[PDB]
Amino acid sequence: GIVEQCCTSICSLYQLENYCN
Amino acid sequence: FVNQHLCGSHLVEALYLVCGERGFFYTPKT
């Protein structure tokens, strides 16, 4: 989930946008 | 701001700025 993708590894805009409604 | 390790409030704030009027969901336990 978001923590694994963006906190413990380097985030990206692509990944952040997966969590927008 | 996006291309770094983002944790906790710092991650919530990035979601806020990127998603704008769409809003977002923050689910840390998945």
Swiss-Prot record, chain B:
<protein>
    <recommendedName>
        <fullName>Insulin B chain</fullName>
    </recommendedName>
</protein>
